[model samples]
Target: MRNYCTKTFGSAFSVTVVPTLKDNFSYLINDHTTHTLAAVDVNADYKPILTYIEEHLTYTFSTILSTHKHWDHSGGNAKLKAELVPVVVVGGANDSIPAVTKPVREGDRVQVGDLSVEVIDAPCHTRGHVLYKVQHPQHPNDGVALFTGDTMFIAGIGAFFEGDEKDMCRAMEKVYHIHKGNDYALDKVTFIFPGHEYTSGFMTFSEKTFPDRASDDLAFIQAQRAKYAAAVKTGDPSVPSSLAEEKRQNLFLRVADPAFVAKMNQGNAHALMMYLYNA
Candidate 1:
Protein backbone atom coordinates (compact mmCIF):
# COMPACT_ATOMS: atom_id res chain seq x y z
CA MET A 1 0.00 0.00 0.00
CA ARG A 2 1.12 3.54 -0.70
CA ASN A 3 -0.54 6.80 0.41
CA TYR A 4 -3.76 6.44 2.33
CA CYS A 5 -6.36 8.33 4.39
CA THR A 6 -8.79 7.38 7.17
CA LYS A 7 -12.33 8.15 8.25
CA THR A 8 -12.94 8.14 12.01
CA PHE A 9 -15.88 5.94 12.91
CA GLY A 10 -16.96 5.23 16.48
CA SER A 11 -14.99 5.18 19.72
CA ALA A 12 -11.84 4.08 17.95
CA PHE A 13 -12.71 2.61 14.60
CA SER A 14 -11.61 4.15 11.34
CA VAL A 15 -11.57 3.01 7.73
CA THR A 16 -8.45 3.73 5.67
CA VAL A 17 -7.44 3.32 2.06
CA VAL A 18 -4.16 2.46 0.46
CA PRO A 19 -4.80 3.77 -3.00
CA THR A 20 -3.51 2.06 -6.09
CA LEU A 21 -1.63 3.64 -8.97
CA LYS A 22 -4.59 3.26 -11.28
CA ASP A 23 -6.86 4.62 -8.57
CA ASN A 24 -9.58 2.04 -9.24
CA PHE A 25 -8.09 -0.50 -6.81
CA SER A 26 -7.22 0.16 -3.18
CA TYR A 27 -6.38 -1.54 0.06
CA LEU A 28 -8.90 -0.92 2.86
CA ILE A 29 -8.24 -0.89 6.60
CA ASN A 30 -10.44 -1.30 9.69
CA ASP A 31 -13.75 -3.19 9.74
CA HIS A 32 -15.46 -0.71 12.11
CA THR A 33 -19.02 -1.57 13.17
CA THR A 34 -19.84 0.89 15.95
CA HIS A 35 -22.92 2.61 14.49
CA THR A 36 -23.86 -0.36 12.41
CA LEU A 37 -26.71 -1.18 14.80
CA ALA A 38 -25.05 -4.57 15.30
CA ALA A 39 -24.95 -5.01 11.54
CA VAL A 40 -21.60 -5.77 9.89
CA ASP A 41 -19.63 -4.70 6.83
CA VAL A 42 -19.84 -1.75 4.48
CA ASN A 43 -23.55 -1.98 3.90
CA ALA A 44 -25.92 0.80 2.86
CA ASP A 45 -25.29 2.72 6.08
CA TYR A 46 -21.60 3.02 5.22
CA LYS A 47 -22.44 5.09 2.18
CA PRO A 48 -21.03 8.32 3.55
CA ILE A 49 -17.63 6.87 4.33
CA LEU A 50 -17.60 4.91 1.10
CA THR A 51 -18.50 8.02 -0.82
CA TYR A 52 -15.69 9.94 0.84
CA ILE A 53 -13.35 7.15 -0.11
CA GLU A 54 -14.59 7.21 -3.67
CA GLU A 55 -14.09 10.94 -3.96
CA HIS A 56 -10.70 11.27 -2.27
CA LEU A 57 -9.26 7.79 -2.65
CA THR A 58 -10.52 7.50 -6.21
CA TYR A 59 -11.03 3.82 -5.65
CA THR A 60 -14.17 1.74 -5.29
CA PHE A 61 -12.90 -1.17 -3.27
CA SER A 62 -14.50 -4.30 -1.88
CA THR A 63 -11.62 -5.89 0.02
CA ILE A 64 -10.23 -4.96 3.44
CA LEU A 65 -6.84 -5.29 5.10
CA SER A 66 -7.43 -5.36 8.83
CA THR A 67 -4.98 -3.99 11.40
CA HIS A 68 -5.91 -6.49 14.12
CA LYS A 69 -8.58 -9.00 15.07
CA HIS A 70 -10.49 -7.08 17.73
CA TRP A 71 -14.24 -7.31 17.13
CA ASP A 72 -14.70 -3.63 16.41
CA HIS A 73 -11.69 -3.56 14.14
CA SER A 74 -12.49 -6.67 12.16
CA GLY A 75 -16.26 -7.07 12.55
CA GLY A 76 -17.02 -5.92 9.02
CA ASN A 77 -14.55 -8.27 7.35
CA ALA A 78 -16.93 -11.19 6.95
CA LYS A 79 -19.79 -9.21 5.55
CA LEU A 80 -17.61 -7.14 3.26
CA LYS A 81 -15.91 -10.28 2.04
CA ALA A 82 -19.22 -12.03 1.45
CA GLU A 83 -20.81 -9.21 -0.50
CA LEU A 84 -17.66 -8.19 -2.29
CA VAL A 85 -16.43 -11.56 -3.48
CA PRO A 86 -12.92 -11.83 -4.81
CA VAL A 87 -12.72 -9.58 -1.76
CA VAL A 88 -9.57 -10.79 -0.04
CA VAL A 89 -9.41 -10.53 3.76
CA VAL A 90 -6.04 -9.88 5.39
CA GLY A 91 -4.48 -9.35 8.89
CA GLY A 92 -2.61 -11.00 11.75
CA ALA A 93 -4.17 -14.47 11.84
CA ASN A 94 -3.70 -14.87 15.58
CA ASP A 95 -6.12 -15.75 18.38
CA SER A 96 -7.27 -12.24 19.32
CA ILE A 97 -8.03 -11.20 15.77
CA PRO A 98 -10.11 -12.73 13.00
CA ALA A 99 -8.50 -15.24 10.64
CA VAL A 100 -7.82 -14.25 7.07
CA THR A 101 -7.45 -15.87 3.66
CA LYS A 102 -4.26 -13.94 3.07
CA PRO A 103 -2.40 -14.16 6.36
CA VAL A 104 0.59 -11.78 6.62
CA ARG A 105 3.64 -11.57 8.89
CA GLU A 106 6.73 -9.45 9.43
CA GLY A 107 9.04 -8.94 6.43
CA ASP A 108 6.09 -9.88 4.21
CA ARG A 109 4.82 -7.21 1.84
CA VAL A 110 1.39 -6.37 0.43
CA GLN A 111 1.25 -4.67 -2.91
CA VAL A 112 -1.00 -3.62 -5.77
CA GLY A 113 -0.11 -1.62 -8.85
CA ASP A 114 2.72 0.67 -7.70
CA LEU A 115 2.14 0.54 -3.95
CA SER A 116 3.52 -1.63 -1.17
CA VAL A 117 3.59 -1.93 2.65
CA GLU A 118 6.46 -3.44 4.62
CA VAL A 119 5.20 -5.54 7.49
CA ILE A 120 6.72 -5.24 10.95
CA ASP A 121 5.91 -7.88 13.55
CA ALA A 122 4.50 -6.20 16.65
CA PRO A 123 3.01 -8.63 19.15
CA CYS A 124 2.54 -6.45 22.20
CA HIS A 125 -1.19 -5.71 22.04
CA THR A 126 -1.83 -9.27 20.96
CA ARG A 127 0.32 -12.13 19.89
CA GLY A 128 1.14 -11.85 16.18
CA HIS A 129 -0.18 -8.33 15.71
CA VAL A 130 1.55 -6.66 12.77
CA LEU A 131 2.28 -3.06 11.79
CA TYR A 132 2.47 -2.19 8.12
CA LYS A 133 4.97 0.52 7.22
CA VAL A 134 3.52 1.98 4.06
CA GLN A 135 6.11 3.37 1.65
CA HIS A 136 6.52 4.46 -1.90
CA PRO A 137 7.38 1.73 -4.40
CA GLN A 138 10.62 3.46 -5.37
CA HIS A 139 10.99 6.30 -2.92
CA PRO A 140 12.98 5.33 0.12
CA ASN A 141 13.26 8.94 1.35
CA ASP A 142 9.59 9.74 1.31
CA GLY A 143 9.66 9.21 5.07
CA VAL A 144 7.81 6.25 6.64
CA ALA A 145 4.05 5.87 6.59
CA LEU A 146 2.55 3.40 9.01
CA PHE A 147 -0.72 1.54 9.49
CA THR A 148 -0.09 0.67 13.14
CA GLY A 149 -3.30 -1.17 13.90
CA ASP A 150 -3.78 -0.90 17.66
CA THR A 151 -0.09 -0.98 18.46
CA MET A 152 -0.01 2.83 18.54
CA PHE A 153 -2.31 5.82 18.00
CA ILE A 154 -2.49 9.58 17.91
CA ALA A 155 -2.17 9.89 21.69
CA GLY A 156 -2.05 6.32 22.98
CA ILE A 157 -1.31 2.66 22.41
CA GLY A 158 -3.33 -0.53 22.57
CA ALA A 159 -4.24 -1.95 25.97
CA PHE A 160 -3.67 -5.46 27.29
CA PHE A 161 -5.31 -8.32 25.56
CA GLU A 162 -3.88 -11.86 25.64
CA GLY A 163 -0.30 -10.54 25.88
CA ASP A 164 1.88 -10.32 28.95
CA GLU A 165 4.28 -7.61 30.20
CA LYS A 166 7.10 -9.34 28.33
CA ASP A 167 5.05 -9.36 25.15
CA MET A 168 4.08 -5.74 25.72
CA CYS A 169 7.69 -4.75 26.32
CA ARG A 170 8.93 -6.50 23.25
CA ALA A 171 6.13 -5.13 21.14
CA MET A 172 6.88 -1.60 22.25
CA GLU A 173 10.60 -2.08 21.70
CA LYS A 174 9.86 -3.34 18.21
CA VAL A 175 7.97 -0.16 17.50
CA TYR A 176 10.91 1.88 18.79
CA HIS A 177 13.17 0.10 16.34
CA ILE A 178 10.84 1.18 13.56
CA HIS A 179 10.64 4.76 14.78
CA LYS A 180 14.16 5.40 16.06
CA GLY A 181 15.91 8.59 14.98
CA ASN A 182 12.79 10.06 13.43
CA ASP A 183 11.90 12.77 15.91
CA TYR A 184 10.34 15.86 14.34
CA ALA A 185 10.49 13.85 11.15
CA LEU A 186 6.80 14.14 10.65
CA ASP A 187 6.81 17.60 12.26
CA LYS A 188 4.19 16.87 14.92
CA VAL A 189 2.19 15.35 12.10
CA THR A 190 2.55 11.73 13.18
CA PHE A 191 -0.81 10.05 13.14
CA ILE A 192 -2.53 6.71 13.60
CA PHE A 193 -5.89 6.20 11.94
CA PRO A 194 -7.62 5.10 15.13
CA GLY A 195 -10.89 3.13 14.97
CA HIS A 196 -13.03 5.72 16.71
CA GLU A 197 -13.97 9.37 17.14
CA TYR A 198 -13.52 9.65 20.88
CA THR A 199 -10.48 11.95 20.84
CA SER A 200 -12.27 14.99 22.29
CA GLY A 201 -13.25 13.21 25.48
CA PHE A 202 -10.14 11.13 26.11
CA MET A 203 -7.77 13.93 27.12
CA THR A 204 -10.46 15.41 29.26
CA PHE A 205 -10.86 12.20 31.21
CA SER A 206 -7.08 11.95 31.55
CA GLU A 207 -6.88 15.43 33.01
CA LYS A 208 -9.70 14.78 35.43
CA THR A 209 -8.07 11.61 36.68
CA PHE A 210 -4.73 13.22 37.37
CA PRO A 211 -5.75 16.63 38.55
CA ASP A 212 -2.46 17.12 40.35
CA ARG A 213 0.21 14.66 39.37
CA ALA A 214 3.95 15.29 39.54
CA SER A 215 4.05 16.57 36.01
CA ASP A 216 1.59 19.29 35.16
CA ASP A 217 2.25 17.78 31.75
CA LEU A 218 0.47 14.53 32.32
CA ALA A 219 -1.36 14.98 29.07
CA PHE A 220 0.25 11.93 27.51
CA ILE A 221 -0.42 9.69 30.48
CA GLN A 222 -3.98 10.91 30.73
CA ALA A 223 -4.57 10.13 27.08
CA GLN A 224 -3.12 6.67 27.52
CA ARG A 225 -5.42 5.93 30.43
CA ALA A 226 -8.33 7.38 28.55
CA LYS A 227 -7.60 5.12 25.59
CA TYR A 228 -7.79 2.07 27.81
CA ALA A 229 -11.08 3.33 29.14
CA ALA A 230 -12.52 3.99 25.68
CA ALA A 231 -11.64 0.56 24.35
CA VAL A 232 -13.28 -1.10 27.32
CA LYS A 233 -16.30 1.16 27.29
CA THR A 234 -17.10 0.94 23.58
CA GLY A 235 -15.31 -2.27 22.68
CA ASP A 236 -13.56 -0.17 20.06
CA PRO A 237 -9.81 0.66 19.91
CA SER A 238 -7.32 3.52 20.34
CA VAL A 239 -3.78 2.82 19.20
CA PRO A 240 -1.04 2.98 16.49
CA SER A 241 1.35 5.25 18.46
CA SER A 242 4.84 6.26 17.38
CA LEU A 243 7.74 4.86 19.40
CA ALA A 244 9.21 8.30 19.97
CA GLU A 245 5.95 9.65 21.37
CA GLU A 246 5.36 6.58 23.50
CA LYS A 247 8.78 7.13 25.04
CA ARG A 248 7.51 10.58 25.89
CA GLN A 249 4.10 9.49 27.27
CA ASN A 250 3.74 5.80 28.09
CA LEU A 251 4.28 4.79 31.75
CA PHE A 252 5.01 1.20 30.77
CA LEU A 253 7.67 2.39 28.39
CA ARG A 254 9.21 4.56 31.12
CA VAL A 255 9.35 1.74 33.65
CA ALA A 256 12.57 0.44 32.16
CA ASP A 257 14.55 3.52 31.28
CA PRO A 258 17.54 3.70 33.64
CA ALA A 259 16.81 7.25 34.74
CA PHE A 260 13.10 6.54 34.94
CA VAL A 261 13.33 3.19 36.67
CA ALA A 262 15.78 4.77 39.10
CA LYS A 263 13.14 7.27 40.11
CA MET A 264 10.68 4.55 41.03
CA ASN A 265 10.41 1.71 43.64
CA GLN A 266 11.55 3.99 46.44
CA GLY A 267 8.37 2.03 46.80
CA ASN A 268 7.66 -1.48 45.56
CA ALA A 269 5.83 -2.60 42.41
CA HIS A 270 2.68 -2.72 44.47
CA ALA A 271 3.04 0.91 45.44
CA LEU A 272 3.81 1.86 41.85
CA MET A 273 0.86 -0.09 40.60
CA MET A 274 -1.25 1.61 43.23
CA TYR A 275 -0.19 5.02 41.99
CA LEU A 276 -0.94 4.10 38.40
CA TYR A 277 -4.09 2.38 39.54
CA ASN A 278 -5.25 5.62 41.00
CA ALA A 279 -3.73 7.86 38.31
Candidate 2:
Protein backbone atom coordinates (compact mmCIF):
# COMPACT_ATOMS: atom_id res chain seq x y z
CA MET A 1 0.00 0.00 0.00
CA ARG A 2 1.18 3.53 -0.70
CA ASN A 3 1.49 5.94 2.21
CA TYR A 4 0.84 9.40 0.89
CA CYS A 5 3.09 12.26 2.07
CA THR A 6 4.22 15.74 1.02
CA LYS A 7 7.82 16.88 0.49
CA THR A 8 9.51 20.17 -0.33
CA PHE A 9 11.10 20.02 -3.79
CA GLY A 10 13.26 23.01 -2.99
CA SER A 11 13.63 25.92 -0.60
CA ALA A 12 11.82 27.92 -3.27
CA PHE A 13 8.19 27.87 -4.39
CA SER A 14 8.00 24.19 -5.25
CA VAL A 15 6.92 20.89 -3.64
CA THR A 16 5.98 17.33 -4.61
CA VAL A 17 3.79 14.58 -3.15
CA VAL A 18 4.79 10.98 -2.57
CA PRO A 19 2.29 8.20 -3.17
CA THR A 20 4.97 5.60 -2.65
CA LEU A 21 8.70 5.45 -2.12
CA LYS A 22 9.48 5.77 -5.83
CA ASP A 23 6.49 7.55 -7.41
CA ASN A 24 5.66 11.22 -6.81
CA PHE A 25 3.34 14.16 -7.53
CA SER A 26 4.92 17.61 -7.91
CA TYR A 27 3.58 21.18 -8.19
CA LEU A 28 4.73 24.80 -8.03
CA ILE A 29 3.06 27.53 -5.93
CA ASN A 30 4.48 30.68 -7.50
CA ASP A 31 3.92 34.41 -7.21
CA HIS A 32 3.44 34.04 -11.03
CA THR A 33 4.28 37.65 -11.87
CA THR A 34 7.68 38.38 -10.33
CA HIS A 35 9.93 37.67 -13.31
CA THR A 36 8.12 37.30 -16.58
CA LEU A 37 10.33 39.91 -18.23
CA ALA A 38 13.76 38.75 -17.10
CA ALA A 39 16.17 36.84 -19.29
CA VAL A 40 15.34 33.11 -19.41
CA ASP A 41 18.62 32.23 -17.67
CA VAL A 42 17.58 34.09 -14.53
CA ASN A 43 14.79 31.53 -13.93
CA ALA A 44 16.79 28.35 -14.39
CA ASP A 45 16.16 27.16 -10.85
CA TYR A 46 12.43 26.80 -11.51
CA LYS A 47 12.99 24.50 -14.48
CA PRO A 48 12.70 21.40 -12.30
CA ILE A 49 8.99 22.07 -11.94
CA LEU A 50 8.49 21.60 -15.68
CA THR A 51 11.13 18.88 -15.86
CA TYR A 52 9.33 16.86 -13.22
CA ILE A 53 5.97 17.35 -14.86
CA GLU A 54 7.20 16.23 -18.30
CA GLU A 55 8.48 12.94 -16.93
CA HIS A 56 5.97 12.17 -14.16
CA LEU A 57 2.65 13.69 -15.10
CA THR A 58 0.22 11.85 -17.25
CA TYR A 59 -3.56 12.34 -17.49
CA THR A 60 -3.85 11.79 -13.74
CA PHE A 61 -1.76 14.70 -12.48
CA SER A 62 -4.44 17.13 -13.54
CA THR A 63 -4.31 19.53 -10.62
CA ILE A 64 -2.33 22.81 -10.64
CA LEU A 65 -2.80 24.77 -7.40
CA SER A 66 -1.15 28.20 -7.68
CA THR A 67 -0.87 30.79 -4.88
CA HIS A 68 -0.57 33.98 -6.96
CA LYS A 69 0.47 35.42 -10.31
CA HIS A 70 3.75 37.09 -9.44
CA TRP A 71 6.52 36.46 -12.00
CA ASP A 72 8.77 34.24 -9.86
CA HIS A 73 5.90 31.93 -8.99
CA SER A 74 3.84 32.17 -12.14
CA GLY A 75 6.64 32.53 -14.70
CA GLY A 76 6.35 28.88 -15.71
CA ASN A 77 2.60 28.81 -16.10
CA ALA A 78 2.91 28.71 -19.85
CA LYS A 79 5.32 25.77 -19.65
CA LEU A 80 3.07 23.87 -17.25
CA LYS A 81 0.03 24.40 -19.43
CA ALA A 82 2.00 23.33 -22.48
CA GLU A 83 3.08 19.96 -21.06
CA LEU A 84 0.52 18.97 -18.40
CA VAL A 85 -3.09 17.92 -18.71
CA PRO A 86 -6.02 19.74 -17.09
CA VAL A 87 -4.59 22.06 -14.41
CA VAL A 88 -6.60 23.99 -11.86
CA VAL A 89 -5.19 27.53 -11.36
CA VAL A 90 -6.79 28.58 -8.10
CA GLY A 91 -6.08 31.66 -5.94
CA GLY A 92 -6.57 35.29 -6.90
CA ALA A 93 -8.67 37.02 -9.51
CA ASN A 94 -6.87 38.34 -12.57
CA ASP A 95 -7.30 37.80 -16.29
CA SER A 96 -3.53 37.95 -16.48
CA ILE A 97 -3.55 34.21 -15.87
CA PRO A 98 -3.02 32.92 -19.41
CA ALA A 99 -3.82 29.39 -18.19
CA VAL A 100 -5.87 29.43 -14.98
CA THR A 101 -8.29 26.52 -15.16
CA LYS A 102 -10.03 27.49 -11.93
CA PRO A 103 -10.11 30.40 -9.46
CA VAL A 104 -10.96 29.96 -5.75
CA ARG A 105 -11.24 31.86 -2.46
CA GLU A 106 -11.48 31.35 1.31
CA GLY A 107 -13.39 28.28 2.67
CA ASP A 108 -13.10 26.51 -0.69
CA ARG A 109 -11.80 22.92 -0.85
CA VAL A 110 -9.58 20.85 -3.20
CA GLN A 111 -9.32 17.09 -3.55
CA VAL A 112 -6.49 14.55 -3.86
CA GLY A 113 -7.83 11.00 -4.12
CA ASP A 114 -9.03 9.87 -0.68
CA LEU A 115 -7.65 13.08 0.82
CA SER A 116 -9.68 16.25 1.30
CA VAL A 117 -8.20 19.74 0.95
CA GLU A 118 -9.10 23.19 2.21
CA VAL A 119 -7.97 26.35 0.41
CA ILE A 120 -7.04 29.11 2.83
CA ASP A 121 -7.30 32.77 1.77
CA ALA A 122 -3.87 33.72 3.00
CA PRO A 123 -3.43 37.25 1.66
CA CYS A 124 -0.87 39.95 2.69
CA HIS A 125 2.08 38.84 0.57
CA THR A 126 -0.12 39.20 -2.50
CA ARG A 127 -3.73 40.02 -3.14
CA GLY A 128 -4.65 36.39 -3.81
CA HIS A 129 -2.14 34.55 -1.67
CA VAL A 130 -3.48 31.33 -0.18
CA LEU A 131 -2.39 28.22 1.74
CA TYR A 132 -3.44 24.68 0.95
CA LYS A 133 -4.22 22.15 3.68
CA VAL A 134 -4.46 18.47 2.79
CA GLN A 135 -6.30 16.40 5.39
CA HIS A 136 -6.99 12.72 5.97
CA PRO A 137 -10.60 11.81 6.54
CA GLN A 138 -10.28 8.08 7.18
CA HIS A 139 -8.18 8.78 10.21
CA PRO A 140 -9.61 12.12 11.27
CA ASN A 141 -6.94 12.20 13.95
CA ASP A 142 -4.26 12.55 11.29
CA GLY A 143 -4.82 16.34 11.23
CA VAL A 144 -3.61 18.26 8.15
CA ALA A 145 -0.46 19.24 6.31
CA LEU A 146 0.07 22.82 4.98
CA PHE A 147 1.73 24.24 1.86
CA THR A 148 2.46 27.94 2.41
CA GLY A 149 4.01 29.90 -0.41
CA ASP A 150 5.84 33.17 0.35
CA THR A 151 3.03 34.07 2.72
CA MET A 152 4.71 32.35 5.66
CA PHE A 153 8.41 31.74 6.34
CA ILE A 154 10.02 29.52 8.95
CA ALA A 155 11.66 32.15 11.18
CA GLY A 156 10.64 35.37 9.41
CA ILE A 157 8.10 36.34 6.71
CA GLY A 158 7.56 38.19 3.41
CA ALA A 159 7.92 41.96 2.81
CA PHE A 160 4.81 44.13 2.50
CA PHE A 161 2.68 44.06 -0.64
CA GLU A 162 -0.75 44.72 -2.30
CA GLY A 163 -2.96 43.69 0.64
CA ASP A 164 -3.19 45.88 3.72
CA GLU A 165 -1.27 45.25 6.96
CA LYS A 166 -4.38 43.65 8.34
CA ASP A 167 -4.27 41.30 5.38
CA MET A 168 -0.90 40.00 6.52
CA CYS A 169 -2.16 39.88 10.07
CA ARG A 170 -5.26 38.03 8.94
CA ALA A 171 -3.11 35.68 6.88
CA MET A 172 -0.94 34.75 9.85
CA GLU A 173 -4.02 34.72 11.99
CA LYS A 174 -5.39 32.02 9.70
CA VAL A 175 -2.00 30.32 9.86
CA TYR A 176 -2.00 30.48 13.67
CA HIS A 177 -5.43 28.96 13.94
CA ILE A 178 -4.70 26.02 11.64
CA HIS A 179 -4.05 23.96 14.76
CA LYS A 180 -7.62 24.46 15.91
CA GLY A 181 -8.63 22.35 12.95
CA ASN A 182 -8.05 18.51 12.78
CA ASP A 183 -8.40 17.95 16.54
CA TYR A 184 -5.98 20.84 17.28
CA ALA A 185 -2.79 18.76 17.65
CA LEU A 186 0.64 19.49 16.22
CA ASP A 187 1.74 15.88 15.71
CA LYS A 188 -1.07 15.15 13.29
CA VAL A 189 0.32 17.34 10.50
CA THR A 190 2.74 15.43 8.30
CA PHE A 191 4.49 18.47 6.77
CA ILE A 192 4.78 22.28 6.54
CA PHE A 193 6.38 22.89 3.12
CA PRO A 194 6.92 26.58 2.33
CA GLY A 195 7.98 28.23 -0.95
CA HIS A 196 11.41 29.57 -0.20
CA GLU A 197 14.93 29.00 1.09
CA TYR A 198 14.69 32.46 2.69
CA THR A 199 15.09 30.85 6.07
CA SER A 200 18.47 29.71 4.77
CA GLY A 201 19.82 33.10 5.78
CA PHE A 202 17.80 33.57 8.96
CA MET A 203 19.89 31.81 11.64
CA THR A 204 22.48 34.52 11.21
CA PHE A 205 20.02 37.28 10.30
CA SER A 206 17.78 36.67 13.31
CA GLU A 207 20.85 36.52 15.51
CA LYS A 208 21.61 40.00 14.21
CA THR A 209 17.95 40.98 14.23
CA PHE A 210 17.84 40.22 17.94
CA PRO A 211 21.23 39.25 19.34
CA ASP A 212 20.50 38.09 22.86
CA ARG A 213 16.83 37.23 22.62
CA ALA A 214 17.22 34.83 19.70
CA SER A 215 20.14 32.98 21.33
CA ASP A 216 19.27 32.64 25.02
CA ASP A 217 16.14 30.66 24.27
CA LEU A 218 15.20 28.14 21.52
CA ALA A 219 18.63 26.44 21.39
CA PHE A 220 17.31 23.10 20.20
CA ILE A 221 14.80 24.85 18.01
CA GLN A 222 17.40 27.28 16.70
CA ALA A 223 19.77 24.39 16.05
CA GLN A 224 17.10 22.70 13.98
CA ARG A 225 16.74 25.78 11.72
CA ALA A 226 20.51 25.76 11.38
CA LYS A 227 20.24 22.14 10.28
CA TYR A 228 17.82 23.11 7.52
CA ALA A 229 20.26 25.72 6.21
CA ALA A 230 23.04 23.14 6.55
CA ALA A 231 21.10 20.69 4.38
CA VAL A 232 21.04 23.21 1.54
CA LYS A 233 24.76 23.94 1.98
CA THR A 234 25.65 20.23 1.82
CA GLY A 235 23.13 19.22 -0.85
CA ASP A 236 20.55 18.00 1.66
CA PRO A 237 16.80 18.61 2.07
CA SER A 238 15.18 21.73 3.52
CA VAL A 239 13.50 22.31 6.90
CA PRO A 240 9.95 21.33 7.81
CA SER A 241 8.18 23.77 10.18
CA SER A 242 5.07 23.09 12.24
CA LEU A 243 2.02 25.25 13.04
CA ALA A 244 2.28 24.63 16.78
CA GLU A 245 6.04 25.14 16.82
CA GLU A 246 5.72 28.32 14.75
CA LYS A 247 3.40 29.81 17.35
CA ARG A 248 6.08 29.20 19.93
CA GLN A 249 9.03 30.78 18.05
CA ASN A 250 8.10 32.50 14.75
CA LEU A 251 8.32 36.24 15.46
CA PHE A 252 6.67 37.45 12.24
CA LEU A 253 3.58 35.53 13.30
CA ARG A 254 3.64 37.65 16.42
CA VAL A 255 1.76 40.97 16.17
CA ALA A 256 1.88 41.84 19.85
CA ASP A 257 5.59 42.07 20.51
CA PRO A 258 5.07 45.37 22.31
CA ALA A 259 8.71 46.30 22.51
CA PHE A 260 9.30 45.26 18.91
CA VAL A 261 6.00 46.54 17.52
CA ALA A 262 6.60 49.79 19.31
CA LYS A 263 9.48 50.31 16.94
CA MET A 264 7.01 49.86 14.05
CA ASN A 265 4.22 52.21 15.02
CA GLN A 266 3.44 50.82 18.45
CA GLY A 267 4.14 47.31 17.13
CA ASN A 268 1.13 46.73 14.89
CA ALA A 269 1.64 43.99 12.27
CA HIS A 270 0.64 46.11 9.30
CA ALA A 271 2.61 49.07 10.56
CA LEU A 272 5.62 46.81 10.88
CA MET A 273 5.12 45.92 7.23
CA MET A 274 5.14 49.58 6.24
CA TYR A 275 8.37 49.94 8.17
CA LEU A 276 9.96 47.07 6.29
CA TYR A 277 8.74 48.31 2.89
CA ASN A 278 10.21 51.76 3.42
CA ALA A 279 13.45 50.44 4.87
Clash number for each model: 15, 21
TM-score of each: 0.59, 0.70
RMSD for each of the candidates: 9.6, 8.7
For candidate 1, write residues 142-202 as lDDT tens digits.
3344666565544434665766555555655565555446654542233344444333344
Question: Which stretches of candidate 2 lie above 4 Å from their native place?
Answer: 1-47, 50-59, 94-96, 181-183, 187-190, 208-216, 256-279
Model 2 — which ten-residue stretch has the worst lDDT? Answer: 35-44
User: Which stretches in model 1 have alpha-carbon errors above 4 Å?
Assistant: 1-48, 54-63, 83-85, 96-99, 181-190, 197-246, 253-258, 263-279
* Cand. 1 TM to true fold: 0.59
Q: After superposition, how far is residue 91 of candidate 2 from its true place, in Å?
A: 3.0
